[PDB]
Amino acid sequence: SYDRAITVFSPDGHLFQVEYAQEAVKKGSTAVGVRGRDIVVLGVEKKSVAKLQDERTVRKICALDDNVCMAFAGLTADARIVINRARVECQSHRLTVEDPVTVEYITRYIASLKQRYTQSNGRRPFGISALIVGFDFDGTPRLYQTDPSGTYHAWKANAIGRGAKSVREFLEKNYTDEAIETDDLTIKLVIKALLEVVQSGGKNIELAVMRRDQSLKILNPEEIEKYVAEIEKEKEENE
Amino acid sequence: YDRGVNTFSPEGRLFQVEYAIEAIKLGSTAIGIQTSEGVCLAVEKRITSPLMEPSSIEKIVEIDAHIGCAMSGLIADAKTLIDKARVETQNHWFTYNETMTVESVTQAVSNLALQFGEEDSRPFGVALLFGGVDEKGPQLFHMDPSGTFVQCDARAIGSASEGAQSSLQEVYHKSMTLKEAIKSSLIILKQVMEEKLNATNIELATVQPGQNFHMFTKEELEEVIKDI
Amino acid sequence: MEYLIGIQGPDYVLVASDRVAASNIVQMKDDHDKMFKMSEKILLLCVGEAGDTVQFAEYIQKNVQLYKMRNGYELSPTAAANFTRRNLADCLRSRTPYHVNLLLAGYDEHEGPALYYMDYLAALAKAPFAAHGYGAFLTLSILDRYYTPTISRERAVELLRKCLEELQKRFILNLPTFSVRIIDKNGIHDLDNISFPKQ
Amino acid sequence: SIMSYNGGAVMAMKGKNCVAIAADRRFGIQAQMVTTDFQKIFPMGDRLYIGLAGLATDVQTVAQRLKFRLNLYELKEGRQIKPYTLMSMVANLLYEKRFGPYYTEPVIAGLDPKTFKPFICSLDLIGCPMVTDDFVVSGTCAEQMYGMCESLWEPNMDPDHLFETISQAMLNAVDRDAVSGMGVIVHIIEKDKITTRTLKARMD
Amino acid sequence: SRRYDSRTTIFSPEGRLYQVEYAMEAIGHAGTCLGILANDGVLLAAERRNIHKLLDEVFFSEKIYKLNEDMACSVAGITSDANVLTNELRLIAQRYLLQYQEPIPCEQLVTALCDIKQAYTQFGGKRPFGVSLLYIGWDKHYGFQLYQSDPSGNYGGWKATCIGNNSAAAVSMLKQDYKEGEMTLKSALALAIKVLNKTMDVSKLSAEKVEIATLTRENGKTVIRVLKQKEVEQLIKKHEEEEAKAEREK
Amino acid sequence: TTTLAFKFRHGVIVAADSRATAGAYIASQTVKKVIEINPYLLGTMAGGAADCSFWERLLARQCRIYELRNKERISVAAASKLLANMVYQYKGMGLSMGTMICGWDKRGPGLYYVDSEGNRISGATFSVGSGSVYAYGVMDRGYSYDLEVEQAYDLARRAIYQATYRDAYSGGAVNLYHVREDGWIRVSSDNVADLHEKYSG
Amino acid sequence: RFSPYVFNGGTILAIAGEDFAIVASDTRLSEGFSIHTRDSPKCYKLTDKTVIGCSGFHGDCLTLTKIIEARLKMYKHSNNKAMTTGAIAAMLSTILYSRRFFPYYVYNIIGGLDEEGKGAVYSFDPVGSYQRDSFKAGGSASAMLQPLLDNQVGFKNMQNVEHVPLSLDRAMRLVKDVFISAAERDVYTGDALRICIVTKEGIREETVSLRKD
Amino acid sequence: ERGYSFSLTTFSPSGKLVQIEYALAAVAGGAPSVGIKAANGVVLATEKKQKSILYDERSVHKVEPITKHIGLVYSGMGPDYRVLVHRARKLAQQYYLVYQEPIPTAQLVQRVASVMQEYTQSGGVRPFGVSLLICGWNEGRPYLFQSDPSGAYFAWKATAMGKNYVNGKTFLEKRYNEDLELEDAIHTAILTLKESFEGQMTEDNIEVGICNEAGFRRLTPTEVKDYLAAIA
Amino acid sequence: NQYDNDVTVWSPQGRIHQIEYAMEAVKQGSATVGLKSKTHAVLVALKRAQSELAAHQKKILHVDNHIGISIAGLTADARLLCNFMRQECLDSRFVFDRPLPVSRLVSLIGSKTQIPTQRYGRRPYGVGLLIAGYDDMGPHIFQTCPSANYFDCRAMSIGARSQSARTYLERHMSEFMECNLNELVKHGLRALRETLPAEQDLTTKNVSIGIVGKDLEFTIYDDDDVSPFLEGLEERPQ
Secondary structure (H helix, E strand, C coil): CCCCECCCECCCCCEHHHHHHHHHHCCCCCEEEEECCCCEEEEECCCCCCCCCCCCCCCCEEECCCCEEEEEEECHHHHHHHHHHHHHHHHHHHHCCCCCCCHHHHHHHHHHHHHCCCCCECECCCCEEEEEEEECCCCCEEEEEECCCCCEEEECEEEECCCCHHHHHHHHCCCCCHHHCCHHHHHHHHHHHHHCCCCCCCCCCEEEEECCCCCCEECCCCHHHHHHHHHHHHHHHHC | CCCCCCCCCCCCCCCHHHHHHHHCCCCCCEEEEEECCEEEEEEECCCCCCCECCCCCCCEEECCCCEEEEEEECCCCHHHHHHHHHHHHHHHHHHHCCCCCHHHHHHHHHCCCCCCCCCCCCCCCEEEEEEEEECCEEEEEECCCCCCCEECCEEEECCCHHHHHHHHCCCCCCCCCHHHHHHHHHHHHHHHCCCCCCCCCEEEEEECCCCCEEECCCCCCHHHHHCC | CCCEEEEECCCCEEEEEECCEECCCCEEECCCCCECCCCCCEEEEEEECHHHHHHHHHHHHHHHHHHHHHHCCCCCHHHHHHHHHHHHHHCCCCCCCCCEEEEEEEEECCCEEEEEECCCCCCCEECCCCEECCHHHHHHHHHHHHCCCCCCHHHHHHHHHHHHHHHHCCCCCCCCEEEEEEEECCEEEECCCEECCCC | CCHHHCCCEEEEEECCCEEEEEEECCEEECCEEEECCCCCEEECCCCEEEECCECHHHHHHHHHHHHHHHHHHHHHCCCCCCHHHHHHHHHHHHHCCCCCCCCECCEEEEECCCCCCEEEEECCCCCCCEECCCEEEEECCHHHHHHHHHHHCCCCCCHHHHHHHHHHHHHHHCCCCCCCCCCEEEEEEECCCEEEEEECCCCC | CCCCCCCCCCCCCCCCCHHHHHHHHHCCCCCEEEEECCCCCEEEEEECCCCCCCCCCCCCCCCEEECCCCEEEEEEECHHHHHHHHHHHCCHHHHHHHHHCCCCCCHHHHHHHHHHHHHCCCECCCCCCCEEEEEEEEECCCEEEEEECCCCCCCEECCEEECCCCHHHHHHHHCCCCCCCCCCCCHHHHHHHHHHHHHCCCCCCCCCCEEEEEEECCCCCCEEEECCCCCHHHHHHHHHHHHHHHHHCC | CEEEEEEECCEEEEEECCCEEECCEEEECCCCCEEECCCCCEEECCECHHHHHHHHHHHHHHHHHHHHHHCCCCCHHHHHHHHHHHHHCCCCCCCCECCEEEEEECCEEEEEEECCCCCEECCCEEEEECCHHHHHHHHHHHCCCCCCHHHHHHHHHHHHHHHHHHCCCCCCEEEEEEECCCCEEEEEEEEHHHHHHHHHC | CCCCCCCCCCEEEEEECCCCEEEEEECCECCCCCCCECCCCCCEEEECCEEEEEEECHHHHHHHHHHHHHHHHHHHHHHCCCCCHHHHHHHHHHHHHCCCCCCCCEEEEEEEECCCCCEEEEEECCCCCEEEECEEEEECCHHHHHHHHHHHCCCCCCCCCCCCCCCHHHHHHHHHHHHHHHHHHCCCCCCEEEEEEECCCCEEEEEEECCCC | CCCCCCCCCCECCCCCEHHHHHHHHHHHCCCCEEEEECCCCEEEEEECCCCCCCCCCCCCCCCEECCCCEEEEEEECHHHHHHHHHHHHHHHHHHHHHHCCCCCHHHHHHHHHHHHHHHCCCCCCCCCCEEEEEEEECCCCEEEEEECCCCCEEECCEEEECCCHHHHHHHHHCCCCCCCCHHHHHHHHHHHHCCCCCCCCCCCCEEEEEECCCCEEECCHHHHHHHHCCCC | CCCCCCCCCCCCCCCCHHHHHHHHHHCCCCCEEEEECCCEEEEEEECCCCCCCCCCCCCEEEEECCEEEECCCCHHHHHHHHHHHHHHHHHHHHHCCCCCCHHHHHHHHHHHHHHHHCCCCCCCCCCCCEEEEEECCEEEEEECCCCCCCEEECEEEECCCCHHHHHHHHCCCCCCCCCCHHHHHHHHHHHHCCCCCCCCCCCCCCEEEEEEECCEEEEEEECCCCHHHHCCCCCCCC
């Protein structure tokens, strides 16, 4: 049994392996997620595919349940084993307490799976960050994020990955009340932000919405061409 | 170059216990005051972004119906100690059919606070305040990363600790009332925080002998702000 | 002790059970449900003693739901029924064996409808029709009397009607009501909760 | 008893350059049939079969643990298994449950793959292998099957007369048994082809 | 005791981690394997490394390992680490078959192994595996499939991929000559001999220097056929006949 | 021992007797067989008096931990499911337990029945105990979903009175609770010897 | 074969008053048809406000007494106060259940003062169920003593009988009379009567002789 | 006590496992040994010089049998050899207690080499310092295999391990063909060990074991003097 | 210095420094003084605080009815041995039904604390226990140390600035074996006024006194009942 402290304190009060793992989050592809009042919208940017190869095995927007979607950044090897451990707990919750899993419950499971994991012996911390987006009972759309140290933290709009603080500065100057008026109006709010990020010229974007009663529904690159047409044409008439 | 995690200084203290005392100078400041009418207990939130939801974070959390808490330093490993304190009060209620006192909650957590090693991995980087009303009246305790707890009368914990502790020794006396101890603490928080004080940057919670643990919300809180 | 039935057709599976939750001499509940969904085209019908029918059958349900979330597509009815047989047979030679009798019903897009049969010793049997309970001694002889492999679902219900009227003629237990399902290319469908008015 | 809980009958018989195996079709619980298509003979590679009789759980359980160990053998090695080697493999599998034993009695029949020579053997429920040169039987109606084979077996038999002997051995012995019947399937293997026939038996 | 530990699990201050990047540096050299599919069938073309004149040439293949009854894999890297991974996912497919009585889908066999491979990069204080490997196979849900694993533990589906010593030279030429869904299993064989003509510095394409295995679907067979050394060289010269005509006529 | 519970338009009514015997000897007449799990849940005592007392006190510990973590109260369906799973781990070892779980929930009234064997069922009316079959006969006659409050008090009170009259192991006093929206309220506690003079004339 | 249990007799009795509590027991240890000793009381003083009585298998009564006395000291070193009467009764209910599948053959009655200076009597089964009562008897002759206190203390089955509370003087002569009747008919009833009285001052003791058959 | 539970064999930044590279240098500094299969059996030959006249040469043996039909020599260091001999003795027995059949020579090398790979990755151990040569006649055709401290293995027609192995392999390339008898392979295996020996090659300076279809055996020093006669 | 990292490593002079550095931890805690008469054992402590509003850190603990201890060092290690101390007293009272002797208790402590001073990656216990109790042989004053070497003594003093307290006890220990409890205590109180700066001494909120006695159970006196003992002392001569 390999018993060894990996993450220890610093001479000034920091944790080296935690603040190193947040940098590895900062070089993954950018994921942007907002929320409305009836429909939520989230979509990763920088698909960056080889464009002659397979694409249904490269997906980074998965489903934990019928009501919980999940996007992430960071390195994908550590990411999908967090998902498979979250898909078991949200199923064992159903064998207990009868309701479907609330979105606040499943984020505490991921954060508590990650905090004790910087505390244990012989383990490097996780190098991912996530966005957990869902609509619970009584129809309340909300989202969260997850730091690699394990601090779950709600939001109204968020953006992680490489080129996040540039987008996160752009989101606060752009998120108004009337931008969450229509469902397709909220989609162009994401599409304007990702186009203000790493390239995202319609071929590297992949959005996915959820209208609080369905599963996750990915639009093919026909509305992503149609939305980027009408968003740039709305910019070409104002300017 | 590399010591263990379990090494004494030549001056004799330790290394990583003393390092964890430095880590709680980065958290948000927190003030609790013991008054014979009851315990008031406040904190700031340190809101970073306008897009952030403000009520999702919290520092005051309750342990039982008659015991509240307040945390500083790191937050993610504070949630482990809170959950051990909640289970400990329920095992005491289960077997003895009574309420565990405020002091004996604290030493049940403080025995856990120094148990890292290389068998069976680092100290906890938090600092806690415990406000409660047991049968000896209202109490106020303060533990450490080192596992040392002591009863205080008015303790200020956070990044602005020694700046507030100087301004808190001059306003406290043994015959305060709870209505003015609340007002006295918000004057201290108004001086030390960065942003202007409103109904969203802070939150309070009081415990009285009569009623149980009560936490203020954004309707009954701003009357004290406008009548500061 | 209590009854269920397994008529299987060319492109459908017709299942039905009773609704009675019994006790010492009284009946506690008159609208019980022995029917457990796992997927959009797979049911489960469990009969046995008190604690083992509920907890084993929902233990299977959390594993079939987990297979769909990890992969995106569902199990076949054959693999689902052959996964349950492993779980009894491993837990049989143990300190706590489950004592349940069950039959599983499913439809697939490749091989069509399917019906399987099990007991408390975990033996599988691909059968065109089956039944459990003491009423199976009364009612299997009507069913192979009139069964056709090419039977329509309209006359399969009235075959089930005839098979249940005789159960209230020469059988000492009460059994007033019966809940009916049907599985086809479109999934689970509820039929009429057929019964006999005891007023 | 425990072996009479479901019934069953398996017979193997050795021919000239061929070997036949037969079994019943009934699945039932002590008085009551359930279905008449229960599989009791399982393929283990080409020209090599195994028959199982006894408790209907361990018929389906051992035939899956044995297939589990067989595919790992034929992938770690580059060849198919000899008929003699499988007999040592099954006898290991049953003897591990020395005190938790499986209630089944296997019968193995097949041709040797290089030199096409027949092979038959049978095992008890804890794995005592017994190779013979004429016939082996297993199941509930064992004593009826010895009166058939002791009076009908000939030493050198073409596959035509081998089929007629093992058919008349099964149709008369199983007819005298109560908990065995409802059809008989007969496999007869040889070095060039393989033949499966189902007999017209009493459904009584 | 903590002075002798090498800390093969921690991060680097620049964010990445060194230990698997050294292993993915060793996966660059020492071997060449490639796969292609567009229609019925999928092939693995591997280049043999030890071509010394005193060997027996047995065990039916050298870098091709039959995993299931209807899928196989080609491997690259440390060969001693390769043998432990092969007989590890070989019984993952059998314990699936023991549990469900159905052959395993080709994708979730890859995800099962790549969780074992990921765990050594994450805890235990252990050397990772310096092995990357391909996967061909068939299943009833998607048909012919093609996968690639990495020592980091992340996989992916593909249509054409090489992990050779000049793999980046090969991939740049694979996406210059292809067609989505129309390269049948003779043009794919013709394109395979063209690619490893380039990436192999040893010229003239000796028929004993390569290995080619195909996976074609026969009704209940899924025939995995390692094609013999009598039909390689006629496929070698078939490339050599057309290239003299295509050069001289241009 | 005789307990009953039925739900109607205005909440859930719970009633029980108070005699606890030992063979043919009566130990006590004042045993409170409807124990109070929470301000919003109720549980009965049927079979082993110590086994129902322990595992429902242990359930009250578990429901309190759920409320602190999730910041709302547990549902009635979730509470019985926890009790059904704890008891199942000791199946065959000889636990005697036949309790019922009552309480208001977000889906309305809740009334589930939990055995020591592993039975967990819903329903509208229940009656558990040695004299339970005497309670079913009178309760099935006067039951309606649309009963008034003072009428439903008289139904459950007289139904216990008929069970103590026939059964030898049932008797004492008649405790009576009422589960409402906000929480349960204790209604009354009448002696059977006082009800005998009441119900005669 | 080796039977792990035996019955050693004994009889205990408690009565809760308005500002007092009386716990009485005999002093005979005996099994079979023989007598071990004529001096073995059951008045055990836990605190100065709590007295327990233990009847049944004497090898368990010695063990259970020493388990409880260890756990009061573990309470005080962790809470800086003494256990109340209601806190001991809740603790011992979990001690008795902790050997559910090999139980103590012990009957227990705890009598003492509550926080308000009133009487409190808790009575146990061998598994650990309890309730608070006004008076309980336990042991061999419990079926003889319980109906008599129902008439006198409980004022049951009497018409036109006044309801005066129990004075200490009336309750002492009531206890002294009811063990004389149980000594005549029961064979396990002892020779001396150890009466312990818990008031606001402290624990008094008193010994009254009986017949010695 | 307990162990270390950490690998002391890591990847270099150049991507080379350094301890396995250093373990091969200990193999190259061992005694020379050659092995040739020829069409009916395999000849293993080694080179055994005692340091002085005081040693009893008939006490220990380089050439070791594993079963009735499998022999094994080495070229490396001494005490590491006797460990994985005793391990390989046992692995042939668990195969036989299951299948009631002598183990094939290919399947033995599957399991000996899997020990050495497992031993070069686990915690707190240094790898072995020997290479092996394994012979045997299973199902008519003979076999000749060679493992290494890394855990790989090969299938040779003829090879040489130890000192001057790069000169031995060039010598075998100009001498070996496909068609030789067993006793012709003996004469060319002593001729290649004479390329690096001392002045006198007596009946006790070498040690030769052979396989036939009759099984593995080891030559007594009587007929070893007969083969050493009429040599060179 | 490379010889100064782990408890296992010996120095070339033969002095393990990690044990010697734990002796520095007991020199950081505040002073306490224990002494005994023929029939009594008195230990007197000196509390400290951090601010004037926080309470004072207590030091004297109750182990059993005839055993009390006084701590000096880091308090979390003190509670780790105190819980061991309580446990070893009441199980001997559970088995033998007798009070465990004091000299036999401390030999369990010396075996308990010697084990981490020889393993790998195990610190010593930094704590300074003064032990006062009763055998059948009268009073006993014991001290321990982080080097697991316990000492039998008749008067000692440990903590910060304790050498001045030892000089007072050596020139007055001829009188200790005669006097009753009244001036036995204010002999020990004259030791604590020696170990202080020259302006503040004994203001009834930083001092605690514990006595175990020949007919007296071990009793801790705190900050109100100290005032009968604390009066009757002369002013500090200067």
